[PDB]
Design a protein around this nucleic acid. Structure first.
Ligand SMILES: [Mg+2]
Ligand SMILES: [Mg+2]
Ligand SMILES: [Mg+2]
Ligand SMILES: [Mg+2]
Lengths: 136, 135
RNA sequence: GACACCUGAC
DNA sequence: GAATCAGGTGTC
């Protein structure tokens, strides 16, 4: 009943214009709201692809810094894709969506070839309100 | 890109739901062509819908081929469907707006028209010409 | 149903 | 900053 935000964490989120549409994501320090990583907007992608990329990017980021901090996401889909090490997107694969699909292929490749200690936690929106990395 | 020889429509309110009004203007001159008397209770989208259909009736009487602009994605769809899917309760308090919506639907189901109904591109062009300002 | 991401409108 | 009215897609 008293699950509480772990402040010493990284929170990730996606923002879009359309879905599918222009996608971006960022990772923030949950405690300060400081931006730790982001990607330049991607012309075409889906919310779920974005959420997935943001978690994997977070894994690589924390791994390189030898960090024990957990990552929070609000995306049940992206969390499942990361644990499965496979994104199951329906987005068409063509010249238009080549960038996002390249990134998703790369993220899967990394997952399938590395280990990591980072706990990946569901952000409890119903208990805590909106995630801290939210675009709004 | 803007079709200046057009009629623009928009809605005003106090509350949503609340008191609603709408009007139509010549998109080029700003002249007000019609203005609805404030209706005591209605929704924004009921108003946006009524404004469009009022514009359609106005142009039909004139056999005019000019387009109508609205900024309401919802209302544009409702007029194309001939059905205003409002969530507002229907009772004695909301009788006037629902009589108006019911009659607008009936008009759409009993007339032909060729008027193009266009989305006003608020992002590119700024606020629609029929806008009710700030209070 | 659920978890998300949007679009247009005192 | 807050609220309400409406119509969408991506996924489990
Ligand atoms: Mg999110
Ligand atoms: Mg968000
Ligand atoms: Mg309007
Ligand atoms: Mg307006």
């Amino acid at each position: 009943a008293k699950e509480e935000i772990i402040w010493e964490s990284l929170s990730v989120d996606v923002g879009s214009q359309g879905n599918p549409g222009i996608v971006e994501y960022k990772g923030v320090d949950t405690k300060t709201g400081e931006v730790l990583f982001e990607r330049e907007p991607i012309p075409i992608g889906t919310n779920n692809m974005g959420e997935f990329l943001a978690i994997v990017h977070g894994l690589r980021y924390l791994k390189e810094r030898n960090s024990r901090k957990p990552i929070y996401s609000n995306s049940q889909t992206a969390i499942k894709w990361v644990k499965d090490k496979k994104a199951k997107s329906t987005l068409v694969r063509n010249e238009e969506t080549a960038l996002i699909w390249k990134l998703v292929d790369e993220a899967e490749e990394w997952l399938n070839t590395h280990t990591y200690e980072t706990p990946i936690l569901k952000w409890q929106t119903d208990k805590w309100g909106e995630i801290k990395a939210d675009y709004g």
